[PDB]
Amino acid sequence: PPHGELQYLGQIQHILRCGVRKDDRTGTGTLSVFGMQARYSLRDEFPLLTTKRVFWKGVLEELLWFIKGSTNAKELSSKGVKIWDANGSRDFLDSLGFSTREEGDLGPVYGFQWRHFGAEYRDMESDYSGQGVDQLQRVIDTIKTNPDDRRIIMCAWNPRDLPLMALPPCHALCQFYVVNSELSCQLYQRSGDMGLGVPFNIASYALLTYMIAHITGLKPGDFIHTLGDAHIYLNHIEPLKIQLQREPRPFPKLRILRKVEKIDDFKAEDFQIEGYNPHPTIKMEMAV
Amino acid sequence: PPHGELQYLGQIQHILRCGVRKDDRTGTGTLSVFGMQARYSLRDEFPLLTTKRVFWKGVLEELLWFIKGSTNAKELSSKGVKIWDANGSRDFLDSLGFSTREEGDLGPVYGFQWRHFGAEYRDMESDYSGQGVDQLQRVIDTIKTNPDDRRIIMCAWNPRDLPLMALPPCHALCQFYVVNSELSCQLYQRSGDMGLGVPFNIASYALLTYMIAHITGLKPGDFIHTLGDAHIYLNHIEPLKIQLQREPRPFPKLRILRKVEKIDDFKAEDFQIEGYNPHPTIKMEMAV
Ligand SMILES: Cc1nc(=O)c2cc(CN(C)c3ccc(C(=O)N[C@@H](CCC(=O)O)C(=O)O)s3)ccc2[nH]1
Ligand SMILES: Cc1nc(=O)c2cc(CN(C)c3ccc(C(=O)N[C@@H](CCC(=O)O)C(=O)O)s3)ccc2[nH]1
Ligand SMILES: O=c1[nH]c(=O)n([C@H]2C[C@H](O)[C@@H](COP(=O)(O)O)O2)cc1F
Ligand SMILES: O=c1[nH]c(=O)n([C@H]2C[C@H](O)[C@@H](COP(=O)(O)O)O2)cc1F
């Protein structure tokens, strides 16, 4: 059976061979394709890429950060994960005309939309308990009890909240699905930085699916990744060309180390990736 | 070059051959597959299906209805199109809890979220002039001023408005994309009745692409249809086996008969389908 990672790389080779040139907001420029889909089995494997070393600690920490509802970049930075610091910096904030905003404050982004969709956002430090829809919880409840439901969706695209956010969410909505005691997730990623964001994003929603499978007594099934604008930034082409030449290695496995009963009780120590020996890291310059 | 229609039929064959048996809200039963994508070209063809007659007037009147921002089945029925009536009727309203709602009042459905996302829904006869977000206008604006934008997005999934609607939307979101003067559109459909809904839906969003292309100066490109739960109801397996035997005739054409400027200007007579020569219609009864 072909390797899970070939979905990703074929998407790469596809964009390199057939992407069209197209300008982007950042000035960098891209080769791009509109609409793609990739299926990654979660069954006795976890799709953390092997053709380059993906920042696992960053994946797990980012997710726990969304779970607890945080729109504070500093809560994440302090766990040693820097990935949102630039989006929360004073300068970046000034550039979007948020001179009045405390730094680290990303606006009403992922964690907020996941746990409080509809609440009126004030700042990153306010308490929102009982405000808006706890979409993440409504998903776990439907799955436990009415698993055949075709509406198990969590959406972060809030048009009322877009003008306040430091970055409009790129993983806009996702849907869970249950058959034969398997929990599958599909992600609509409106915009996908193939070299940098994407491999991370696959680990992210793969993991979310493991967590949710765990607390609901289901076995993980498929992760289905759908992209809108799938782009390779021009400065990523050489590094990616390098990446392609590597033979993929067995995907690692994921061990959840104890019985956890609520999603919010999960802590970093509960997760152990075993058997991960990726090829060496590949730096891609992030466009700003 | 294979016929675009072979994408639709291919998905039916895939479901029938590989779908897992899955229960549904209506107790009808289905054959289900989670996560699919198809790409219909819109260049010098319009993907109205030929392997059975698609109710085109219905497509056209339903879209103008959504554009008008209407949420009243009667304003669509009066134009000879009855597809939303069961959902807007007294008994059905009461069944859902809306003792209080005037007959025809579907709640805050597609038209509302497209035109006035965020506004507190009153009833169907209300005026919502400048009251929530106008996702539709914004999409056209963004295509005109900044075509390269990776956030050209329309969303009907408002978790708050959900418990007020007759049927949570299947057209959960769509994204528009521009490159080399070509406009494309990707629809995310969380739930597809492959027999009844889907062929209608393909036409629907293909039309909207042709409209927005017309008032933005663009040639239409691809429509990408992505699927959440792609099902065939059990009492559709037979009509569809009949349907798979017919050989598709060349897709028809569509012409916009006059230069129109705003999206609201469009009227049913602005559109002519040329060359639509379908096989005889097959009735698929709607599961309830
Ligand atoms: C143009 C752009 N592309 C992105 O991929 C992107 C990603 C994020 C946030 N995000 C979802 C990220 C996931 C991983 C990331 C990253 O830069 N990590 C480096 C390693 C950094 C480290 O080791 O500390 C990497 O994966 O190479 S950034 C924010 C803005 C963006 N902007
Ligand atoms: C379970 C279910 N499946 C659906 O496909 C569906 C579709 C709609 C709305 N919709 C998107 C529809 C599109 C087309 C329709 C229909 O019934 N068409 C007939 C009318 C033709 C005629 O008599 O002239 C048909 O296709 O034959 S209904 C509403 C609830 C649903 N419910
Ligand atoms: O999780 C993410 N994944 C990702 O690929 N991006 C990239 C895609 C794009 O390159 C940029 C967002 O840019 P835009 O808003 O112009 O689509 O970030 C961002 C994330 F947060
Ligand atoms: O445009 C549509 N297309 C469609 O396929 N459905 C179908 C999908 C499903 O069979 C049912 C909705 O039920 P659920 O909400 O349980 O998915 O209606 C409804 C529409 F309005």
Residue numbers in the entry:
A (entry chain B), B (entry chain A): 26 to 313
Provide excerpts from the study:
Human thymidylate synthase adopts two different conformations, named active and inactive, that equilibrate with each other. 5FU and RTX are both used in chemotherapy against solid cancers. They inhibit hTS by targeting the enzyme active site.
The present crystal structure of the hTS:FdUMP:RTX complex shows six independent enzyme subunits arranged in three homodimers in the triclinic unit cell. In particular, FdUMP occupies the same binding site as the natural substrate, dUMP, and is at contact distance with the catalytic Cys195. The RTX terminal glutamic acid displays weak electron density and appears disordered and in different conformations.
